[PDB]
Amino acid sequence: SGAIYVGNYRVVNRHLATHNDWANLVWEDSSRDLLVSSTTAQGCDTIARCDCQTGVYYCSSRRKHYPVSFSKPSLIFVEASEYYPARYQSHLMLAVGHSEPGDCGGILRCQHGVVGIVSTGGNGLVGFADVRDLLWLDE
Ligand SMILES: COc1ccccc1CN1C[C@@H](C(N)=O)CCC1=O
Ligand SMILES: [Zn+2]
């Protein structure tokens, strides 16, 4: 679990969105595994606007943060789960590291701010859904 809070927005993994997230929907994209809902409270996370390929992510299945190198956002084939059939997920970044389904929502950060959230894993890889291209999150 986990979310990003910036301004009047809440960014979560689309497959973990609640009834309240869907009742206050701002934007969602199944191909990216992202959903953004509106909030009444003001959030103060900072979104990165950069092309970093190194950062640190939080792994709840180890209660640890890990430094990683990751690929630039791209279209990657993701095996089926109970939430999606096998498909290409867009705007995904991969790194070598540990990830279990419950790790989804853990933040990946660089020196400029939040880069994305855990969205995929297995076979010793971890995948992060990018948010750096969503410029409207700041306004
Ligand atoms: C071993 O599978 C994983 C490991 C870490 C994280 C996630 C998974 C598998 N997964 C993929 C998600 C997606 N983005 O398509 C949907 C929910 C889910 O359980
Ligand atoms: Zn950066």
CSV table of C-alpha atoms and ligand atoms in Angstrom, one decimal:
chain,number,residue,atom,x,y,z
A,1,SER,CA,0.0,0.0,0.0
A,2,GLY,CA,1.0,3.7,-0.3
A,3,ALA,CA,0.1,6.9,-2.0
A,4,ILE,CA,1.6,10.3,-3.1
A,5,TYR,CA,0.0,13.5,-1.7
A,6,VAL,CA,0.6,16.7,-3.7
A,7,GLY,CA,-1.6,19.7,-3.5
A,8,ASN,CA,-5.3,18.6,-3.7
A,9,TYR,CA,-4.3,15.3,-5.3
A,10,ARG,CA,-3.9,11.7,-4.1
A,11,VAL,CA,-1.9,9.3,-6.4
A,12,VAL,CA,-2.4,5.6,-5.9
A,13,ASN,CA,-2.0,2.3,-7.8
A,14,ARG,CA,-5.2,2.0,-9.8
A,15,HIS,CA,-5.7,-1.6,-8.7
A,16,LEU,CA,-5.7,-0.5,-5.0
A,17,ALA,CA,-8.1,2.5,-5.5
A,18,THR,CA,-10.9,2.7,-2.9
A,19,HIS,CA,-14.6,3.6,-3.4
A,20,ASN,CA,-13.8,7.2,-2.2
A,21,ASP,CA,-10.9,7.4,-4.8
A,22,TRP,CA,-13.4,6.4,-7.6
A,23,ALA,CA,-16.1,8.8,-6.2
A,24,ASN,CA,-13.6,11.7,-6.3
A,25,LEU,CA,-11.9,10.6,-9.6
A,26,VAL,CA,-9.6,13.2,-11.3
A,27,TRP,CA,-7.7,10.9,-13.8
A,28,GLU,CA,-7.0,7.1,-14.3
A,29,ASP,CA,-5.1,5.0,-16.8
A,30,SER,CA,-5.3,1.2,-16.7
A,31,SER,CA,-2.3,0.9,-19.0
A,32,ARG,CA,-0.2,2.8,-16.4
A,33,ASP,CA,-1.7,1.2,-13.2
A,34,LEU,CA,-2.4,4.8,-11.9
A,35,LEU,CA,-5.4,6.6,-10.4
A,36,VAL,CA,-5.5,10.2,-9.1
A,37,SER,CA,-8.3,11.3,-6.8
A,38,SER,CA,-9.1,14.7,-5.2
A,39,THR,CA,-8.5,15.6,-1.5
A,40,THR,CA,-9.8,18.3,0.9
A,41,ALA,CA,-6.5,18.4,2.9
A,42,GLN,CA,-3.5,20.0,1.2
A,43,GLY,CA,-0.6,17.5,0.5
A,44,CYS,CA,3.1,18.6,0.5
A,45,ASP,CA,5.1,15.8,-1.2
A,46,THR,CA,7.3,17.2,-4.0
A,47,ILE,CA,7.2,15.6,-7.5
A,48,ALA,CA,10.6,15.2,-9.3
A,49,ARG,CA,10.9,17.0,-12.8
A,50,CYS,CA,14.1,15.4,-14.1
A,51,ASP,CA,15.4,12.3,-16.0
A,52,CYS,CA,17.3,10.7,-13.1
A,53,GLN,CA,18.0,7.0,-13.4
A,54,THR,CA,19.1,6.5,-9.7
A,55,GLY,CA,17.1,6.8,-6.5
A,56,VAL,CA,15.8,5.1,-3.3
A,57,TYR,CA,12.6,3.1,-2.8
A,58,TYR,CA,10.7,1.9,0.2
A,59,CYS,CA,10.1,-1.9,0.4
A,60,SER,CA,7.5,-2.9,3.0
A,61,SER,CA,8.2,-6.6,2.7
A,62,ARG,CA,11.7,-5.9,4.1
A,63,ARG,CA,10.9,-2.7,6.2
A,64,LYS,CA,13.8,-1.1,4.3
A,65,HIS,CA,14.7,1.5,1.8
A,66,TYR,CA,17.1,0.4,-1.1
A,67,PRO,CA,19.2,2.5,-3.5
A,68,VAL,CA,18.6,1.4,-7.1
A,69,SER,CA,19.5,2.2,-10.7
A,70,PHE,CA,16.3,2.1,-12.9
A,71,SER,CA,15.5,2.1,-16.7
A,72,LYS,CA,13.7,5.2,-18.2
A,73,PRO,CA,9.9,4.9,-18.4
A,74,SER,CA,8.8,2.5,-21.2
A,75,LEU,CA,6.3,-0.1,-22.5
A,76,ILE,CA,7.0,-3.4,-20.7
A,77,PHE,CA,5.3,-6.8,-20.8
A,78,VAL,CA,3.7,-7.6,-17.4
A,79,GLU,CA,2.4,-11.1,-16.6
A,80,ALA,CA,-1.2,-11.6,-15.5
A,81,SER,CA,-2.3,-11.1,-11.9
A,82,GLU,CA,-5.8,-11.1,-10.3
A,83,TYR,CA,-6.2,-7.4,-11.3
A,84,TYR,CA,-5.2,-7.5,-15.0
A,85,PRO,CA,-4.6,-10.0,-17.8
A,86,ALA,CA,-1.1,-10.2,-19.2
A,87,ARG,CA,-0.5,-6.9,-21.1
A,88,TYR,CA,2.0,-4.1,-21.9
A,89,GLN,CA,2.1,-1.6,-19.0
A,90,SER,CA,3.3,1.9,-20.2
A,91,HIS,CA,5.5,4.5,-18.4
A,92,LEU,CA,7.1,1.6,-16.3
A,93,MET,CA,10.7,1.8,-14.9
A,94,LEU,CA,12.5,-1.4,-13.9
A,95,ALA,CA,15.3,-2.1,-11.4
A,96,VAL,CA,17.0,-5.1,-9.9
A,97,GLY,CA,15.5,-5.5,-6.4
A,98,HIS,CA,12.9,-7.1,-4.2
A,99,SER,CA,9.2,-6.5,-4.7
A,100,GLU,CA,6.0,-8.5,-3.5
A,101,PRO,CA,2.4,-7.5,-4.5
A,102,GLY,CA,1.9,-5.8,-1.1
A,103,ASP,CA,4.9,-3.5,-1.8
A,104,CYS,CA,2.8,-1.6,-4.4
A,105,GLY,CA,2.5,2.0,-3.5
A,106,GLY,CA,6.0,2.3,-2.0
A,107,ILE,CA,7.7,5.5,-3.2
A,108,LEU,CA,10.8,5.8,-5.4
A,109,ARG,CA,12.6,9.2,-4.8
A,110,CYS,CA,15.6,10.9,-6.3
A,111,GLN,CA,17.3,14.2,-5.2
A,112,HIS,CA,14.5,16.2,-7.0
A,113,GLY,CA,11.5,14.5,-5.3
A,114,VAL,CA,9.1,11.7,-5.9
A,115,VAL,CA,9.7,9.7,-9.1
A,116,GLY,CA,7.0,7.0,-9.0
A,117,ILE,CA,5.5,4.2,-7.0
A,118,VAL,CA,6.1,0.4,-6.9
A,119,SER,CA,3.6,-1.3,-9.4
A,120,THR,CA,5.2,-4.6,-10.5
A,121,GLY,CA,7.8,-7.3,-9.5
A,122,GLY,CA,9.0,-10.8,-9.3
A,123,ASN,CA,12.0,-12.7,-10.7
A,124,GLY,CA,14.3,-10.3,-8.7
A,125,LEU,CA,13.0,-7.2,-10.5
A,126,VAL,CA,10.9,-4.3,-9.2
A,127,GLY,CA,8.9,-2.0,-11.4
A,128,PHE,CA,7.8,1.6,-10.7
A,129,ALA,CA,4.9,3.5,-12.3
A,130,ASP,CA,6.4,7.0,-13.3
A,131,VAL,CA,4.6,10.2,-12.2
A,132,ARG,CA,7.3,12.8,-13.4
A,133,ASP,CA,5.5,13.4,-16.7
A,134,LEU,CA,2.2,14.4,-14.9
A,135,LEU,CA,2.9,18.1,-14.8
A,136,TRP,CA,-0.7,19.1,-13.8
A,137,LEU,CA,-0.1,17.5,-10.4
A,138,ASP,CA,1.7,20.8,-9.4
A,139,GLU,CA,-1.0,23.2,-10.5
B,1,LIG,C1,4.8,-11.2,-8.3
B,1,LIG,O1,3.9,-10.2,-8.8
B,1,LIG,C2,4.1,-8.9,-8.3
B,1,LIG,C3,5.2,-8.5,-7.5
B,1,LIG,C4,5.3,-7.2,-7.0
B,1,LIG,C5,4.3,-6.3,-7.3
B,1,LIG,C6,3.2,-6.7,-8.1
B,1,LIG,C7,3.1,-8.0,-8.6
B,1,LIG,C8,2.0,-8.4,-9.5
B,1,LIG,N1,1.0,-7.4,-9.7
B,1,LIG,C9,1.2,-6.6,-10.9
B,1,LIG,C10,0.4,-5.3,-10.9
B,1,LIG,C11,0.4,-4.6,-12.2
B,1,LIG,N2,0.9,-3.3,-12.2
B,1,LIG,O2,0.0,-5.1,-13.3
B,1,LIG,C12,-1.1,-5.6,-10.5
B,1,LIG,C13,-1.1,-6.3,-9.1
B,1,LIG,C14,-0.1,-7.3,-8.8
B,1,LIG,O3,-0.2,-8.1,-7.9
B,2,ZN,ZN,15.8,13.5,-10.2
